[PDB]
Amino acid sequence: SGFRKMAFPSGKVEGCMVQVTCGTTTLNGLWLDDVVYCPRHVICTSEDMLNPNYEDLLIRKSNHNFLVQAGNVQLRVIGHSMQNCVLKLKVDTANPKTPKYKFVRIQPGQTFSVLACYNGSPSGVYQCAMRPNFTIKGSFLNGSCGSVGFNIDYDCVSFCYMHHMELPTGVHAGTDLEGNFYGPFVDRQTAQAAGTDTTITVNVLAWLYAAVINGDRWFLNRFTTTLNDFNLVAMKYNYEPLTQDHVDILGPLSAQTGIAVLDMCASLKELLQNGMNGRTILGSALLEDEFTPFDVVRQCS
Amino acid sequence: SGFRKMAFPSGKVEGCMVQVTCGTTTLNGLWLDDVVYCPRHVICTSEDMLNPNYEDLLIRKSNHNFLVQAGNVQLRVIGHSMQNCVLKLKVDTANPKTPKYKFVRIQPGQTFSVLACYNGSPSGVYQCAMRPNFTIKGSFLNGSCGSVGFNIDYDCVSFCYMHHMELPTGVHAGTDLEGNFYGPFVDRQTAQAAGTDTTITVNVLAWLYAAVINGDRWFLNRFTTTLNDFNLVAMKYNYEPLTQDHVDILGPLSAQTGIAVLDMCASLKELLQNGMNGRTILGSALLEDEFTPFDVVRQCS
Ligand SMILES: *[C@H](O)[C@H](C[C@@H]1CCNC1=O)NC(=O)[C@@H]1CC(C)(C)CN1C(=O)c1cc2ccccc2[nH]1
Ligand SMILES: *[C@H](O)[C@H](C[C@@H]1CCNC1=O)NC(=O)[C@@H]1CC(C)(C)CN1C(=O)c1cc2ccccc2[nH]1
Ligand code: NA
Ligand code: NA
């Protein structure tokens, strides 16, 4: 037992991280087969960052302007092209450590692991949720761009995120691996705002089930609510509506604990209205929404 | 910016994980050079688990009784020996993926990454602190024994923990890699209690500095306290005494923020006496003590 925020093992992704330099800008790239993927803003300069024309900037580049380093070995760039907000650098060597992989785009409310990297060297791994407002609450410093987010299923790495920028509020924005931004963000040197965020209700309920499985039961009660009466309370506290699909997704956890989803919903209503009265749930004094039902089943089955 | 619980990249340790089976018990082992390390309780049975004589149990074993599997390859055991509560299985092949490593024992209050593994296959990575009472609050299921904890410095893996057991309270106990338990625990099938725990004061202060660096300032005040007056409050709330060495260790963070350690101590006193009044610090509604000063400097420099 126990319940911890838990990342996927990062080895398969570590073997794909390289350093990419253009001019005086260094960031990370992802080396899969004979292509290195990185943020296109590597080609921007201080003179042209407020609103770059990236098409013009790339036309003016040559292969030799890109310095790609895999550990202590320079990789020769033999082609370059733009893919939305990502650059694809074709190199003369296929990465021998290329895992089985896919490029997936994730939905708000889903989680993934981030391998934070600097100068092409992995520094740390943590778990993040894609927020309803298409930001992530990460931990990224200067030089972290090109760090990626991923999930692993069997032996296959599903890449879902590449890091591009930090918003004024200190949250993070980036793209899928096709170079399409999550959310209404653009890769220029401007202060941009995310939409209003909301709490991921289905995840809060999953975490409450995790708590029960781990022996935290104080917040349980004999009451049940209707889906509609619950959603009335949800709206009031800036929680997303709970749907029948969510109820279905929570089915395994409901079966394991013997607590119906609408029974647990009555607990959540009570916690929203009354707070915790000095108590904690799984070591937290607030309601946690960055664990999916899948994440819970992984540690609690 | 941002501040997340962050594990070390796990690749170097992933390349060392194997499966060890004796009889009907399967758990994990750590394969370094030509030795596999695992918990000695792999040789216990349901008939003899309340209080095994491990010396007798090992005398009755042969090399062929140990089945060691590295991925899809059986490793031939050519020697076996006991090292306190660890078994050392000499194998006929040196692990080609052996990193530079050390076996260190850690102190209470220090952190490390855990690579949770089942059937010799890495499942997840998370960060833990060694508690004052020599337990860890981990996430471990049946089959997780032999999973290891570690820190990485440059290219060198410092192994500090191997997992052996779960206490009745749901916290975890294990050994260093020399097979010596952390705390007053023994590897038998009995319910054992840890000593009373305490809060790691120096870590709480480090995390408060992290918060300031990340723009959380509401808990700051114009007051300073003496070390002795602070320790009077610490004792009252089951916090460890703060020492001058701790003040010194916090020096870089104090310099970075311009807030003297004894200034921050006045904030901590106020938070202990008054609570947060509905507010949060770095996304938490309680005071967090599982980040060391080093951990903070890593994400906040
Ligand atoms: C890439 O390494 C870097 C990562 C940032 C640095 C600090 N923490 C991070 O996550 N990205 C950037 O610096 C990106 C590149 C640009 C898209 C060109 C701009 N940028 C921003 O993060 C950026 C610029 C800017 C201006 C005003 C307010 C916020 C703001 N963010
Ligand atoms: C090893 O895979 C396993 C890991 C446990 C299983 C559940 N979560 C974990 O962390 N270890 C054990 O099962 C160890 C082996 C023994 C030392 C022989 C006993 N054991 C315990 O964890 C254990 C036995 C026992 C009895 C009564 C109360 C608690 C208790 N823990
Ligand atoms: Na109920
Ligand atoms: Na103060």
From Swiss-Prot, chains A, B:
Localization (cell): Host cytoplasm; Host Golgi apparatus; Host nucleus
Active-site residue numbers: 41 (for 3cl-pro activity), 145 (nucleophile)
Regulation of this protein's activity per its record: Inhibited by pyridone-containing alpha-ketoamides compounds 13a and 13b. In turn, alpha-ketoamide 13b (tert-butyl (1-((S)-1-(((S)-4-(benzylamino)-3,4-dioxo-1-((S)-2-oxopyrrolidin-3-yl)butan-2-yl)amino)-3-cyclopropyl-1-oxopropan-2-yl)-2-oxo-1,2-dihydropyridin-3-yl)carbamate) inhibits SARS-CoV-2 replication in human lung cells. Inhibited ex vivo by michael acceptor inhibitor N3. Inhibited ex vivo by compound 11a and 11b.
Outcome recorded upon mutating residue 49 to A: Does not affect ability to cleave and inactivate human TRMT1
Record-annotated Peptidase C30 domain positions: 1-301
Segments on the Cytoplasmic side according to the record's topology features: 1-301
Catalytic activity: TSAVLQ-|-SGFRK-NH2 and SGVTFQ-|-GKFKK the two peptides corresponding to the two self-cleavage sites of the SARS 3C-like proteinase are the two most reactive peptide substrates. The enzyme exhibits a strong preference for substrates containing Gln at P1 position and Leu at P2 position
Domain of life: Viruses
Crosslink position(s): Glycyl lysine isopeptide (Lys-Gly) (interchain with G-Cter in ubiquitin): 5, 90
Mutagenesis / variant outcome for changing residue 90 to R: In strain: Beta/B.1.351
Subunit and partners: 3CL-PRO exists as monomer and homodimer. Only the homodimer shows catalytic activity. Interacts with host FBXO22; this interaction promotes the proteasomal degradation of nsp5.
Record's function text: Cleaves the C-terminus of replicase polyprotein at 11 sites. Recognizes substrates containing the core sequence [ILMVF]-Q-|-[SGACN]. Cleaves and inactivates human TRMT1, preventing tRNA guanine(26)-dimethylation of tRNAs. May cleave human NLRP1 in lung epithelial cells, thereby activating the NLRP1 inflammasome pathway. May cleave human GSDMD, triggering alternative GSDME-mediated epithelial cell death upon activation of the NLRP1 inflammasome, which may enhance the release interleukins 1B, 6, 16 and 18. Also able to bind an ADP-ribose-1''-phosphate (ADRP).
Identification of the protein by name: 3C-like proteinase nsp5
Annotated organism of origin: Severe acute respiratory syndrome coronavirus 2 (2019-nCoV)
Covered range of the whole protein: 3264 to 3564 of 7096
